[PDB]
């Protein structure tokens, strides 16, 4: 995350981090329930084998609430396309259940109609992760969050050099140099409504990070609620 602030104790309990064989966080994910993690399909291609860490806020320090889980099943959207990044969504079924606790809790899945007319019409959403703090800098050892305003669909289309499909939305500042960034991919984009946080997106991609005139692109989760639901009955 470029900008924003550190997630304070217990503030982003649904953040999951996908870790490779060298124990390096390469993508984020959102805790959906004790057995399921929501992530981007494109992150699957970033590690031959990976595990999932929860309850972590500082990669260099022992907090005590961290726990690594192996993935028993990866459910990728079979229509995911690398050339366009369309359908960038995947669900991971964990081998062992997550026990919720301080810094470990699931984000709520909303219902589509309500989510689109009410959550996505709110001014902002919140994105978080251990990604790069600067476009060409190093990934964060501290979990960060950033409030990103929703961006009008047409402005979204006009800003991009790549195709923005109906399974994506833009969020961020055109001006301000605050944005998700590399390493944050697959992570959560949530919208708070009356003190409750609902999943509204998955960090997908972006032309650089925090560039003027550019926005961060996210997978439109509301278009895949039935798909996620079905996947969770695996």
């Amino acid at each position: 995350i470029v900008g924003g602030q550190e997630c304070k104790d217990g503030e982003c309990p649904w953040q999951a981090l996908l870790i490779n064989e060298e124990n390096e966080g390469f993508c984020g994910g959102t805790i959906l329930s004790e057995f399921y993690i929501l992530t981007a399909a494109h992150c699957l291609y970033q590690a031959k084998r990976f595990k999932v860490r929860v309850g972590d806020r500082n990669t260099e320090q022992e907090e005590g609430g961290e726990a690594v889980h192996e993935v028993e099943v990866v459910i990728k959207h079979n229509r995911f396309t690398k050339e366009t990044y369309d359908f960038d969504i995947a669900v991971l079924r964990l081998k062992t259940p997550i026990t919720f606790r301080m810094n470990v809790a699931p984000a709520c899945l909303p219902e589509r109609d309500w989510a689109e007319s009410t959550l996505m019409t709110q001014k902002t959403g919140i994105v978080s992760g251990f990604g790069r703090t600067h476009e060409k800098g190093r990934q964060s050892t501290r979990l960060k969050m950033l409030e990103v305003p929703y961006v009008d669909r047409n402005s979204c289309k006009l800003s991009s050099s790549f195709i923005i499909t109906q399974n994506m939305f833009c969020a961020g500042y055109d001006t301000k140099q605050e944005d998700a960034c590399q390493g944050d991919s697959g992570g959560p984009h949530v919208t708070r409504f009356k003190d409750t946080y609902f999943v509204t997106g998955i960090v997908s991609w972006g032309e650089g990070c925090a560039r003027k005139g550019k926005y961060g692109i996210y997978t439109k989760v509301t278009a895949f609620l039935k798909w996620i639901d079905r996947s969770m009955k695996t």
Partner: protein, 52 residues
Amino acid sequence: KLCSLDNGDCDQFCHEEQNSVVCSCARGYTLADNGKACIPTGPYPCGKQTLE
């Protein structure tokens, strides 16, 4: 207005049926007697920061 007027007074999901509002909640919540509020059923309901 119904759901368009302050989410129909619902804590969470609001839907309009036969010109009226129907509220509902996310899993882990029970709709209250007032048919509007959402009450957690456990200590770690979804969507809640663990500020405990």
